Amino acid sequence: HHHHHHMVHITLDRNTANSWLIISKDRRQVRMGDTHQNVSDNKERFSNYPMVLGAQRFSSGKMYWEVDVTQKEAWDLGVCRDSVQRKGQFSLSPENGFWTIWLWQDSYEAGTSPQTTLHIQVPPCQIGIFVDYEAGVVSFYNITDHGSLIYTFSECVFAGPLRPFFNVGFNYSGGNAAPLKLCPL
């Protein structure tokens, strides 16, 4: 792909984070802590899953960023509406305001409803995410495999400002402690 020149500097919004997440000083990395991180509750925090939003809001234009997923067993990545549900149980779907892909149990899927199997020959260590607001497109790229396309959501109905979306996943296995990291431009 040739989307690299739309690169944006994403930072994580601490106030939206699940109370077990640990966000680095530079707000560029996030991992699952082994306990509650001693923060007050608020209406923005994702309560049921290890999720956090980017601080940036996008309502027009073309945007690109990269995320490092090295040695993780489970994660979700993409964008979501600013007004997505924070509390209780929900599925990741465009109907609920999410445009995402994930790794889970050794398979990659896109968060359609129902979910779509992805075909990835080279397990990615970094993921590129491209948003074209006007066109209604969200695309995902395998940076480890020379930028090859993973998935395109088209005909998106964003219906609001978008925020970068992250889920570090649970660590029931002891094999999923590694962070998500926003990669430098």
Considering its fold, how many domains does the chain have in total? 1
What are the structure tokens assigned to 185, written together?
A: 């431009």
The method of structure determination was: X-ray
- 8 Å CB contact between 100 and 45: no
The amino acid sitting at 121 is Q
Residue 51: which of 118, 98, 9 has the closest Cα? 98
Q: Strand 137-142's sheet: what is its strand order?
A: 21-23, 29-32, 180-182, 62-68, 126-132, 137-142, 148-153
CATH of the domain at 123: 2.60.120.920
Its domain, for residue 45, covers 4-182
In the block, tokens 């397990």 appear at 123
- 8 Å CB contact between 113 and 52: no
18-32 per-residue burial string, b: 16 or more CB within 10 A, e: under 16: bbbbebeeebbbbbb
Distance of CA 62 to the CA centre of its chain: 17
Could you tell me if residue 24 is left (phi over 0), alpha (psi between -120 and 50 degrees) or otherwise beta?
A: beta
- 8 Å CB contact between 53 and 163: yes
Strands annotated E in the chain? 21-23, 29-32, 51-53, 62-68, 75-81, 98-104, 107-110, 116-117, 126-132, 137-142, 148-153, 162-167, 180-182
